């Protein structure tokens, strides 16, 4: 009964790499396709029946790889073809914390326009906007933001998208963010405020620019230190210099 069924050693050989065995085959030809880009590879593929949400090891599907690498057309045809918007990955990251990690703007719209919940979270419940500060990407924040993403959501460890720019020193999205209405005097788990990060890992222009906006230097963390006691407790001079100096 076997002669019914495919046989031969080629077939899965020549997906990816390079005579190096691979242990599993997670890897379809639909991921590589999609994460080259090729619309056509793509539409050949979904028309012989490739499964459109298969999941590689740590559980990637092809939306992911194409939004990941910023393939506009790829992704409008996998959405159109139905892959599933919200798939996640084994940390909990949509297709949309992908497009976002790699700053690419079409991408990121094109979710949107399918109704991707803005502020969908990873595991460490991490917005696309807490990607976007993590990773400095001013551009694609900014469409976030004027899609109503929440400027004061919360992390597992407390951290919104301000104090992660502040502790990324991420300067262009820390003052769009306040732009926005991120609170600069939101707290941690264990009650940093944003000049508290940024004080602590010495970026000096982000705790400038946060006291010109108002960031009370004589607020406490939970252990009692203010900005000076974390600047002064990590060594940044500079920081500590700007602070008793102003």
Same mark, same amino acid.
Do not use: H, K, M
């Given at each position: 009964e076997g002669q019914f069924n495919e046989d031969g050693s080629?077939?899965?050989? *020549?997906?990816?790499?390079?005579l190096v065995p691979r242990g599993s085959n997670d890897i379809t030809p639909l991921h590589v396709a999609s994460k080259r880009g090729n619309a056509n590879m793509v539409k050949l593929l979904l028309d012989r029946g490739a499964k459109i949400d298969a999941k590689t090891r740590d559980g990637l599907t092809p939306l992911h790889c194409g939004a990941r690498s910023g393939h506009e057309q790829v992704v409008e045809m996998l959405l159109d073809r139905?892959?599933?918007?919200?798939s996640k990955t084994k940390?909990?990251?949509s297709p949309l914390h992908m497009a976002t990690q790699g700053d690419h703007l079409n991408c990121v719209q094109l979710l949107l326009q399918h109704?991707?919940?803005?502020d969908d979270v990873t595991?460490? *419940?991490?917005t696309a906007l807490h990607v976007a500060a993590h990773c400095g990407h001013y551009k694609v924040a900014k469409v976030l933001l004027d899609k109503k993403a929440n400027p004061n959501a919360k992390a597992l460890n407390g951290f919104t998208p301000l104090h992660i720019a502040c502790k990324k020193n991420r300067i262009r999205v820390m003052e769009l963010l306040l732009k926005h209405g991120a609170s600069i005097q939101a707290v941690t788990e264990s009650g940093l405020t944003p000049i508290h990060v940024a004080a602590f890992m010495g970026h000096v222009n982000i705790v400038s620019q946060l006291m010109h906006h108002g960031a009370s230097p004589n607020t406490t963390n939970?252990?009692?230190?203010?900005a000076l006691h974390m600047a002064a407790r990590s060594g940044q001079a500079e920081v500590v210099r700007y602070l008793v100096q102003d």
């Open positions: 080629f077939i899965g050989q *020549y997906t990816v790499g390079s139905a892959a599933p918007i919200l940390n909990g990251l109704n991707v919940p803005v595991n460490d *419940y991490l939970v252990r009692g230190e203010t």
